[PDB]
Amino acid sequence: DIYSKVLVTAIYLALFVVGTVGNGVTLFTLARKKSLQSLQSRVDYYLGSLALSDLLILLFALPVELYNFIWVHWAFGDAGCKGYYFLRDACTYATALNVVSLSVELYLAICHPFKAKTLMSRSRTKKFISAIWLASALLAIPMLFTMGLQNLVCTPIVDTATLRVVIQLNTFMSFLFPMLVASILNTVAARRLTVMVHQPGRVQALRRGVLVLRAVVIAFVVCWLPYHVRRLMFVYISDEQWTTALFDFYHYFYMLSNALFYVSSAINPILYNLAEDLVEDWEKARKLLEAARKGQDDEVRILLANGADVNTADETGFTPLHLAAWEGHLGIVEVLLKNGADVNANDERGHTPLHLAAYTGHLEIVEVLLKNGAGVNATDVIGTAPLHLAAMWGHLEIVEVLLKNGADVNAQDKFGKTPFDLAIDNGNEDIAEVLQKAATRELEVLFQ
Ligand SMILES: COc1cccc(OC)c1-c1cc(C(=O)N[C@]2(C(=O)O)[C@@H]3C[C@H]4C[C@H](C[C@@H]2C4)C3)nn1-c1ccnc2cc(Cl)ccc12
Numbered sequence: 001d002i003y004s005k006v007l008v009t010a011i012y013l014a015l016f017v018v019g020t021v022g023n024g025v026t027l028f029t030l031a032r033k034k035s036l037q038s039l040q041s042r043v044d045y046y047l048g049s050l051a052l053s054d055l056l057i058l059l060f061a062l063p064v065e066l067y068n069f070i071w072v073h074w075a076f077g078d079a080g081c082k083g084y085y086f087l088r089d090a091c092t093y094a095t096a097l098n099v100v101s102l103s104v105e106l107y108l109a110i111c112h113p114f115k116a117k118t119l120m121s122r123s124r125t126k127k128f129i130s131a132i133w134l135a136s137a138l139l140a141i142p143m144l145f146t147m148g149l150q151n152l153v154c155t156p157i158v159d160t161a162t163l164r165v166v167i168q169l170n171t172f173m174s175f176l177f178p179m180l181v182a183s184i185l186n187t188v189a190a191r192r193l194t195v196m197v198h199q200p201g202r203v204q205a206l207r208r209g210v211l212v213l214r215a216v217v218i219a220f221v222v223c224w225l226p227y228h229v230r231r232l233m234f235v236y237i238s239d240e241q242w243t244t245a246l247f248d249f250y251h252y253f254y255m256l257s258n259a260l261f262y263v264s265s266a267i268n269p270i271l272y273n274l275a276e277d278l279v280e281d282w283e284k285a286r287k288l289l290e291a292a293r294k295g296q297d298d299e300v301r302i303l304l305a306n307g308a309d310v311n312t313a314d315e316t317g318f319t320p321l322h323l324a325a326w327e328g329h330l331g332i333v334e335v336l337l338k339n340g341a342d343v344n345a346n347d348e349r350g351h352t353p354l355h356l357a358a359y360t361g362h363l364e365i366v367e368v369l370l371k372n373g374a375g376v377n378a379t380d381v382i383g384t385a386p387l388h389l390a391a392m393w394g395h396l397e398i399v400e401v402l403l404k405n406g407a408d409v410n411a412q413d414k415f416g417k418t419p420f421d422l423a424i425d426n427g428n429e430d431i432a433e434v435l436q437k438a439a440t441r442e443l444e445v446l447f448q
Helices: 002-031 038-071 077-111 113-118 122-139 160-198 202-235 244-294 297-305 320-327 330-338 353-360 363-371 386-392 396-404 419-425 429-439 441-447
Strands: 147-150 153-156
Touching: 002 038, 002 244, 038 077, 038 122, 038 202, 038 244, 077 113, 077 122, 077 147, 077 153, 077 160, 077 202, 160 202, 202 244, 244 297, 244 320, 244 330, 297 330, 320 330, 320 353, 330 363, 353 363, 353 386, 353 396, 363 396, 386 396, 386 419, 386 429, 396 429, 419 429, 429 441
Parallel strands: none
Antiparallel strands: 147 153
């Protein structure tokens, strides 16, 4: 139908530009990045080799299928008819062999790190990626002789029996065999790394390579499995003609698998980067929360430089600033604020860093917070404000600073207690006297 033609055409154009940009940016990045780790540079060479095959499908295969299949009712020549299937077949091999070769290098590095250290270099990996690309072209040569131009339409130039044989072998050799090998090696590599880790940043690269691979495998398996199942349906089909429902099913499934093929190649960079960056982000986030609390000045400085989230909140809603303000680390509080730390950050109860700074009696930090635009009158779910906690725990110095920055003396909590009530009940006579004076500010100012 026309609705289906418009739907699919839009998806192809979306996949094309996003895939071309994504894989295009990837190649530029990985080509022009200087990784300070031998193993991680080799992982990049494989992702660069995958980005190349991803781009060839999107620039040479997608437009032909878009044009000479769905969009319009053949005009790419015999070279194009043969070239299309050859190039598409070649890329799928190059992908499957890149994923296997990568999974092999990771497996050896984890299970045999001693041998892998001496018997693996960037030059050796560059040698195999060539071999992968050269072997891919070698295995894809049969497709040049199975499809040809006749009448002008691009149709098979061999009997269905012979065509069934090459397609069957292709699906097994190009997908089923390698993907399973990659999957097993990846699964085993991940398990033995856990044991290997338990016993400078080689483990991070090995952890990154496993995550990257795992996601890249799942993406291409999920996306090409329907496409290859379809090709096995072709070779193992029953008699001519079936129920209209069955014809509708195979037609939709054919049209679907066609589209799903280009999904994998398009959003692969985004998917493996997202997954890898999520773990690295979460890691650096939790490292910052502990470094900020423990009082590690150097650790916090490095982690913020490495691009850790300064405003990251924990399960209880605490940011690095909350704990740094609580534990009384003035050096870190300033460093955090300089890096754009949210000074009015809330938690589960709705406490700000100023609530915690006042409670623990950190005068110097209380000022630096306020100086950087901290809410002096900020209240929690109970209705407690910094002035309540400062007066409560007998911190006269802070009470003066808070009042000096316009702290509400009449502010009450759920229990109907003012900062004065807390000061009096806690036997803080010194604080309570200043609070009663502050309350009579309006009276004295005008009259006197
Ligand atoms: C008997 O084949 C199937 C049975 C059930 C479901 C099917 O597709 C989901 C298929 C199927 C697969 C292919 C299938 O994979 N074409 C090719 C491809 O690359 O896609 C074409 C055509 C040949 C040479 C070459 C490589 C193969 C096989 C290009 N084509 N194809 C179909 C063949 C015949 N009639 C069909 C009718 C319907 Cl409604 C749907 C699919 C049909």
